[PDB]
Enzyme design. Structure first.
Site, PDB file in Angstrom:
ATOM      1  N   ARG A  47      54.691  51.130  50.668  1.00 33.93           N
ATOM      2  CA  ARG A  47      53.453  51.417  51.382  1.00 33.93           C
ATOM      3  C   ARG A  47      53.428  50.762  52.756  1.00 33.93           C
ATOM      4  NH1 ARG A  47      50.807  51.781  46.357  1.00 33.93           N
ATOM      5  NH2 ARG A  47      52.094  53.338  45.279  1.00 33.93           N
TER       6      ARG A  47
ATOM      7  N   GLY B 133      44.028  50.383  42.747  1.00 41.08           N
ATOM      8  CA  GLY B 133      44.655  50.228  41.453  1.00 41.08           C
ATOM      9  C   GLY B 133      43.666  49.934  40.349  1.00 41.08           C
TER      10      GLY B 133
ATOM     11  N   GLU C 127      53.052  49.772  38.793  1.00 38.79           N
ATOM     12  CA  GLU C 127      52.656  51.115  39.216  1.00 38.79           C
ATOM     13  C   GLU C 127      51.194  51.148  39.659  1.00 38.79           C
ATOM     14  OE1 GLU C 127      54.225  53.823  39.791  1.00 38.79           O
ATOM     15  OE2 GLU C 127      56.173  53.693  38.793  1.00 38.79           O
ATOM     16  N   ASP C 128      50.860  50.268  40.604  1.00 40.09           N
ATOM     17  CA  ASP C 128      49.534  50.214  41.213  1.00 40.09           C
ATOM     18  C   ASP C 128      48.461  49.784  40.222  1.00 40.09           C
ATOM     19  OD1 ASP C 128      50.701  51.302  43.624  1.00 40.09           O
ATOM     20  OD2 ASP C 128      50.554  53.280  42.682  1.00 40.09           O
ATOM     21  N   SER C 129      48.834  49.020  39.206  1.00 36.29           N
ATOM     22  CA  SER C 129      47.872  48.443  38.282  1.00 36.29           C
ATOM     23  C   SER C 129      47.603  46.994  38.670  1.00 36.29           C
ATOM     24  CB  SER C 129      48.381  48.545  36.848  1.00 36.29           C
ATOM     25  OG  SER C 129      47.421  48.041  35.943  1.00 36.29           O
TER      26      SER C 129
END
Ligand code: ZN
Ligand code: ZN
Ligand code: ZN
Lengths: 48, 64, 48, 115, 339, 257, 79, 48, 48, 44, 184
Positions: free
Chosen positions: E198, E166, E27-29
């Site tokens: 994306r 992130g 999740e964009d980490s």
């Protein structure tokens, strides 16, 4: 909407699809590693 | 600002190679040849010198 | 004026009665932790 | 602000046990070894050495949380073999292999250096 | 070349692996290499300046720079006033933490109130410069620069040049990170799930071109509408350096040393550390000060304010049916009063 | 008694790297060995900097950061030195640390390069590896750097400055006989330097009974230790961790009974 | 007698009965159930609820203004 | 002074938040019921 | 609706106000449900 | 209370009452000198 | 019940939302009691008929014996009772489900237990629930023959307006006009 609001997402969802494929086979050592991360495990290793 | 002492990825020492790297470029070496001459084989270390900006030279222009 | 104080989102009623700032609250960035339970939250020691 | 000291991953604070043994009630002849300030380094070799023991039924380790510094090793043996005995034998086998590896590496250096 | 970006760069070229390693980049980490950070990777300095002016205005009222004694001065706080020098100014090279006084300012009482400047609670730095001069108004003027070094932490924002921002979800040491056969570990690991929706294909091309640039020794050209550069051309160049033409490499699990079944797309990508650092955002309130008009918790992190429990939060708790918790938030934890 | 019987072949040994092969080991042991090369092989590095003067364009803890990363000779003195935490002295002493000094003033018009050659140790056994030299800071005329540093024992698990390696290449099954990695298009993948295959075939035939048994290493040294000393120090350090563990396990077993 | 409301305890009654009973236990009220190594007032209230020993009567107000008094033991707990 | 630190029944000790503490944990905008959910606190050593 | 050959049972208007003034409060209650259901379920979303 | 001039770099002793200004060149921007207290930096 | 359903669902859409999943409950009973579909069943068909009748009385939404309460109770559970009767019918219990007496008794208990758990709890803020349930989807709706839809259409419905943005009238032809394009 009388349905779950959270589910399996991202890595776990992508990996569980790969994991449950017909041709995924795990060796004795690999299985014992996974059962270490199963909190509800009864401690009995299933027959392969 | 200044040449990092170690490569960020593997920890190889690169802070003693900036002046040598500049000298090799002065000797008409291509950047790839100069990096090879300095022994930087892994592209992580080549990244360190190939992409370094020596701003400390600009900072030395300002009087203390 | 008095009327201006009471009306609007930031007015007395909506801004200070229907909603208000509270004690014993914390805010910070959130990062993933696959090793926590769905019902757990990892909390910094400074907040705790 | 909340950064733990770097040494906290390998140093035991006072009153902390390096290793604790807890019997596993789910199945017989199973024990859980909680080792403090250890990571995948010792967890993996001990687990792999135990799997070489024919009397060990289950061998597995886990790091419950990467930010914590514990490894839990679960060992299950046959009724005539104790998990603690398997654990000790596994370490001796590892120590013997490492000591033998040290001796054979020193010989290799001398041979290479000599010519 | 015309933005002077070479002269004043705002990022670092990072060995980035696009892999699902341990679930800490979901999740964009982002997973960062702890060892790389130990070597100055994305280390930054935060400079904060405090300006204070002593002005005399009024019949007998004036402000001066001095160390306020707990007895002589009326106003006072639980902070530490020991760091201040005789002239009321902290000295350069002194470590200062939250609730420390850097400027000792006293205003004569109509004995004297305390208007001393308190260092930001979160801030923990070293006094860098202490400039004293006369401002435009001719009054004595002091600026104090406090220097704090910011080592990338969990929760710090990082972005590529393609909208893939992130926060750092975890930092692994070099041995824990996955490695190539050459011993190269990624400085950063981003989740593969950030790419598909994306459609930041330029991120993948930059990684592929970055690999060729680092191996070839030439800065790569990523000018947008350039037919001279194609993915196939970049891929063909990469093959010449003993790498898979599509930028994949066989990576070994750092925990077990076993080859990962899938080959990982890995290569140099320019990332940039964003201003947003978690330590500047973490905020906790437990019975702080209250504002004069409403007698409710103050507003703002810098004022130790409380978080707003707004109408939407209130509407949510009504649906929960938690009447007592709703009463706590809106009555007991905000402004309990008796009439 | 199910210990392995590893064999060692050293292929290349230089001053910077040692290239060797271990055979007849488990993958866990081979991985734990490389993992100790990086994180648990002690060396001596600067971990305590006290700056008396710094007029350079680099702030104080910028300088201290570089000083910590400068490799120091640790080949034999590191074993003698005690961990400052373990040592019974005050903050520091010669038995747990090495004192360093740096005093550079620039007064010439030419830029003065403060390098590791300007670091002077109180013990000849622990010196900067370069003594080109590592650049600490460049000084302008009228700028000075005056600091004293203490180098102490440590390993990479704490900070990367105590990591003695400049890259540990680790490899096994170069021909992918075990199929631990599955290539969608094996023909597209370069052959390993240890590959024993012919140019025509890209993968070795699958081995159903195969196991990782031969492991290839290339331990490059930062300079603090000789590459062969890193391996020996790792093997003894890893053995020490296990022997220390078993001593604790013996007490726990005895305590329970 | 003559009760029209549900014989089951609602989730909102369970939340308040447990919370109210926990505070009573936390304020040194006698514990109706036998506890073994239990010191959390909220966990003790859970044991009493399971044992149907909470000495609390729920008064359910009807829309017409009347009410029905139910003993916590009378109501059917969700578990 | 330990005399004032002596506890007796009826006193309240405002102790630090510890593992297992129940908290409400919210993300704005709060649009539905799951925007605010209860979590058991776990203390972990970082700022997020 | 009054027109010949036009079905007066199913012929409907999407205008809520027109339904109310022609068919009544209960018809607009049903029409309002159908119109609101149309916007919610237009993209396949489901609400109980 | 020594002050280094921001232009000519001259250490100047200024009390809490006298004006802040360089003795030699009269420059109006002064800088406090580095504290004698020595801070310890971990080289990490 | 079949004719009642035809009125409730003239479109013939059999997909409904009901409290208890009877098909899965039967599946659970088959596994729990190891029902063998091949062997003949020991469940008397009358026990199925009587058992379902007794179960229906236990599932009470509007308690009370007066005619008004009885009618509301019949109406409140009409759909479920039709679904229950058409699933726990004697023909099907013996033909495909093949449940035994023990399994059927357990099945009746589960339907009662799960049905009671489905009853709305007094004190439930259903208005707030409905507002969030119809508001949360709005956050994913788009904004703009053509007919207004999404958020702009939702506004017209709740902001009831004399003049809709896109008023429309769906006319259904009655006689031969419906099936004849020329006559239409
Ligand atoms: Zn490198
Ligand atoms: Zn000592
Ligand atoms: Zn001057």
């Amino acid at each position: 909407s009388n349905r779950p609001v959270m589910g399996i997402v991202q890595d776990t969802l992508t990996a569980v699809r790969k994991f449950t494929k017909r041709d995924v086979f795990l060796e004795r050592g690999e299985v014992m590693n996974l059962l270490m991360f199963l909190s509800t495990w009864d401690g009995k290793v299933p027959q392969p | 600002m200044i040449i990092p002492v170690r490569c960020f990825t593997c920890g190889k020492i690169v802070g003693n190679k900036w002046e040598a790297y500049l000298g090799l470029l002065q000797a008409e070496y291509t950047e790839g040849d100069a990096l090879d001459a300095l022994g930087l084989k892994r592209y992580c270390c080549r990244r360190m010198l190939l992409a370094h900006v020596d701003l400390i030279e600009k900072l030395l222009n300002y009087a203390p | 004026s008095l009327k201006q104080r009471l009306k609007g989102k930031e007015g007395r009623v909506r801004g200070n009665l229907m909603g208000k700032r509270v004690d014993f609250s914390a805010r910070t960035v959130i990062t993933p932790d696959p090793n926590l339970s769905i019902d757990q939250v990892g909390v910094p020691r400074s907040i705790a | 602000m909340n950064a733990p000291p770097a040494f906290e991953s390998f140093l035991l604070f006072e009153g902390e046990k390096k290793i604790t043994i807890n019997k596993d009630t789910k199945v017989p002849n199973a024990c859980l070894f909680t080792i403090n300030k250890e990571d995948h380094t010792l967890g993996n070799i001990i687990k792999s050495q135990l799997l070489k023991d024919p009397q060990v039924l289950f061998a597995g380790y886990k790091v419950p949380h990467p930010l914590e510094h514990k490894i839990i090793i679960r060992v299950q043996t046959t009724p005539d073999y104790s998990p603690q005995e398997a654990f000790t034998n596994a370490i001796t086998d590892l120590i013997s292999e490492l000591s033998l590896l040290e001796e054979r590496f020193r010989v290799a250096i001398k041979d290479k250096q000599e010519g | 070349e015309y933005l002077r970006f070479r002269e004043l760069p705002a990022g670092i070229n990072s060995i980035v692996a696009i892999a699902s390693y341990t679930g800490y980049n979901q999740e964009d980490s982002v997973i960062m290499n702890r060892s790389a950070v130990d070597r100055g990777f994305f280390r930054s300095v935060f400079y904060r300046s405090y300006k204070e002016q002593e002005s005399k205005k009024g019949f007998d009222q004036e402000e001066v720079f001095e160390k306020p004694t707990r007895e002589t001065c009326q106003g006072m706080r639980h902070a530490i006033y020991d760091k201040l020098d005789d002239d009321g100014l902290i000295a350069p090279g002194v470590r200062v933490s939250g609730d420390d006084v850097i400027i000792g300012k006293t205003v004569t009482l109509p004995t004297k109130r305390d208007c001393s400047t308190f260092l930001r609670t979160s801030e923990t730095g070293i006094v860098d410069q202490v400039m004293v001069t006369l401002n435009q108004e001719g009054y004595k003027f002091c600026k104090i620069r406090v220097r704090s070094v910011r080592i990338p932490q969990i929760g710090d924002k990082f972005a590529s040049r393609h909208g893939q921002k992130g926060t750092c979800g975890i930092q692994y040491r070099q041995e824990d990170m996955p490695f190539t056969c050459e011993g190269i570990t990624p400085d950063i690991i981003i989740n593969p799930h950030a790419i598909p929706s994306r459609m930041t294909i330029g991120h993948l091309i930059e990684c592929l071109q970055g690999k060729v640039s680092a191996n070839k020794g030439e800065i790569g050209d990523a000018t947008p509408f350039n037919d001279a550069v194609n993915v196939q051309k970049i891929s063909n160049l990469l093959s010449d350096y003993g790498y898979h033409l599509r930028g994949n490499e066989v990576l070994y699990n750092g925990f077990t040393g076993r080859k990962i079944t899938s080959q990982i797309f890995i290569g140099p990508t320019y990332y940039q550390r964003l201003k947003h650092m978690v330590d500047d955002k973490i905020h906790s309130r437990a019975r702080g000060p209250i504002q004069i008009l409403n007698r409710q918790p103050m507003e703002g992190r810098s004022r130790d304010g409380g978080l707003r429990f707004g109408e939407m939060e209130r509407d949510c708790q009504i649906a929960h049916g938690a009447a007592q918790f709703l009463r706590e938030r809106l009555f007991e934890a905000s402004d309990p009063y008796q009439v | 008694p199910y210990a392995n019987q590893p064999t060692v072949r050293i292929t290349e040994l230089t001053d910077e790297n040692v290239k060797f092969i271990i055979e007849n080991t488990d993958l866990a042991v081979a991985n734990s060995i490389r993992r100790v090369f990086i994180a648990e092989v002690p060396i001596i590095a600067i971990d305590w900097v006290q700056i008396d003067a710094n007029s350079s364009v680099l702030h104080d803890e910028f300088i201290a950061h570089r000083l910590g990363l400068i490799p120091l000779t640790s080949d034999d003195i590191v074993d003698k030195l005690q961990y400052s935490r373990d040592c019974t002295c005050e903050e520091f002493c010669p038995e747990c640390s090495v004192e360093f000094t740096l005093d550079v003033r620039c007064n010439e018009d030419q830029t003065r390069h403060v390098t590791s050659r300007d670091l002077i140790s109180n013990s000849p056994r622990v010196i900067p590896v370069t003594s080109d030299d590592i650049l600490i800071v460049k000084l302008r005329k009228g700028q000075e750097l005056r600091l004293r540093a203490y180098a102490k024992k440590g390993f990479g698990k704490e900070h990367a400055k105590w990591n003695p390696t400049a890259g540990v290449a680790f490899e096994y099954d170069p021909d992918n006989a075990l199929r631990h990695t599955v290539y969608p298009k094996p023909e597209e993948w370069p052959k390993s330097e240890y590959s024993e295959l012919d140019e025509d075939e890209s993968q070795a035939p699958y081995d159903p009974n195969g196991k990782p048994e031969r492991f290839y290493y290339n331990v490059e040294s930062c300079g603090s230790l000789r590459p062969e000393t890193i391996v020996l120090s790792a093997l003894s350090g890893l053995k020490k961790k296990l022997s220390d563990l078993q001593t604790q396990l013996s007490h726990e077993i005895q305590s329970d009974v | 007698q003559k009760r029209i409301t549900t014989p089951y305890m609602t989730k909102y009654e369970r939340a308040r009965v447990l919370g109210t009973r926990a505070l009573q236990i936390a304020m040194c009220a006698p514990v109706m159930v036998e506890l073994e190594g239990e010191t959390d007032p909220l966990l003790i209230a859970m044991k009493e609820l399971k044992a149907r020993k909470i000495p609390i009567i729920i008064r359910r107000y009807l829309p017409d203004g009347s009410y029905e008094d139910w003993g916590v033991d009378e109501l059917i707990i969700s578990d | 002074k330990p005399s004032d630190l002596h506890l007796q029944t009826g006193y309240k000790v405002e102790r630090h938040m510890c593992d297992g503490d129940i908290v409400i944990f919210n993300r704005q905008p709060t649009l539905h019921k799951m925007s605010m959910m209860g979590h058991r606190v776990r203390i972990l050593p970082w700022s997020t | 609706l009054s027109e010949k050959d036009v079905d007066p049972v199913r012929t409907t208007s999407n205008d809520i106000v027109e339904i109310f003034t022609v068919l009544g409060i209960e018809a607009v209650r049903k029409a309002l449900e159908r119109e609101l259901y149309h916007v919610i379920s237009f993209d396949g979303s489901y609400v109980n | 209370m020594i002050y280094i001039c921001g232009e000519c770099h001259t250490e100047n002793e200024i009390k809490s009452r006298d004006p802040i200004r360089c003795r030699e060149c009269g420059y109006r921007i002064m800088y406090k000198k580095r504290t004698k207290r020595l801070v310890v930096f971990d080289a990490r | 019940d079949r004719e009642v359903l035809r009125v409730i669902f003239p479109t013939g859409d059999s997909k409904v939302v009901l409290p208890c999943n009877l098909l899965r409950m039967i599946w659970n009973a088959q596994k729990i009691f190891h029902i063998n579909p091949r062997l003949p069943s020991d469940l008397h068909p009358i026990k199925v008929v009587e058992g379902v009748k007794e179960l229906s009385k236990k599932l009470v939404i509007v308690n009370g014996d007066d005619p008004l309460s009885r009618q509301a109770q019949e109406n409140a559970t009409l759909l479920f009772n039709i679904h229950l009767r058409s699933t726990l019918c004697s023909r099907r219990m013996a033909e495909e489900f093949r449940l035994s007496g023990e399994a059927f008794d357990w099945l009746l208990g589960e339907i009662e237990s799960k049905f009671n758990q489905a009853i709305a709890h007094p004190g439930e803020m259903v208005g707030a629930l409905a507002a969030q349930s119809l508001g949360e989807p709005a956050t994913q709706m788009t904004l703009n023959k053509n007919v207004t839809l999404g958020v702009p259409r939702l506004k017209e419905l709740i902001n009831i307006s004399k003049k809709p943005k896109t008023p429309s009238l769906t006319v259904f032809l009655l006689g031969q006009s419906a099936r004849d394009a020329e006559r239409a």
